[PDB]
Amino acid sequence: MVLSEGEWQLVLHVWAKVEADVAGHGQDIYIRLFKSHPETLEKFDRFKHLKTEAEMKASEDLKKQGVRVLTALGAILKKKGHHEAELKPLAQSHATKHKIPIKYLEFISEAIIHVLHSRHPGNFGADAQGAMNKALELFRKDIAAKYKELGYQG
Ligand code: HEM
Numbered sequence: 001m002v003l004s005e006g007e008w009q010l011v012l013h014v015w016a017k018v019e020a021d022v023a024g025h026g027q028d029i030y031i032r033l034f035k036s037h038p039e040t041l042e043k044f045d046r047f048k049h050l051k052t053e054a055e056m057k058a059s060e061d062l063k064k065q066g067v068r069v070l071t072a073l074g075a076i077l078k079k080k081g082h083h084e085a086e087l088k089p090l091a092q093s094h095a096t097k098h099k100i101p102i103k104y105l106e107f108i109s110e111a112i113i114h115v116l117h118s119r120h121p122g123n124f125g126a127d128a129q130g131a132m133n134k135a136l137e138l139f140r141k142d143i144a145a146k147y148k149e150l151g152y153q154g
């Protein structure tokens with residue numbers, strides 16, 4: 001699939017607000033993912049012991065992880081679909097090292113949309129949410145194809 005430039009601009013205008021405080025947005029996204037789909041926390045060997053939202057919020061390592069994840073995703077979005085180089089290493093680590101099914105990529109995509117809808121009504125109206133869903137679907141579609149090339153079902 002292919003996004004229009006207008007759609008990419010709606011994605012990048014909300015991402016500019018995320019970048020005001022990437023750490024805080026990453027904590028909210030993880031808290032939402034782990035609360036909504038608790039099975040996903042089991043994939044993180046360093047964090048799977050966390051029991052409550054308060055513990056998740058206080059984890060300096062989880063906060064650092066969130067920054068890494070949103071910064072990598074932000075670099076993919078800024079390529080506006082020309083993200084083959086960025087997707088290579090990520091697909092390899094997520095298929096082979098971490099073993100993250102496509103379904104769990106759908107769960108984190110849902111969590112990102114939920115947090116942007118909550119924090120950024122000014123830049124996350126219906127058209128902008130639609131454009132971000134398209135961008136994240138494109139990301140998952142391209143990751144899934146790479147998973148298959150790498151020998152992972154997903
Ligand atoms: C937007 C989708 C995602 C992005 C951009 C992303 C990005 C990253 C990056 C950049 C790293 C560090 C380098 C690497 O190992 O590749 C990482 C590590 C990791 N990712 Fe993801 N990730 C995503 C989704 C997920 C999901 C949904 C899960 C699990 C349910 C997951 C599980 C992990 C784990 C377990 C690690 C190792 C963390 C640690 O060092 O403790 N990832 N991810």
Ligand SMILES: [O-]
Pocket residue numbers: 069
């Ligand atoms: O992650």
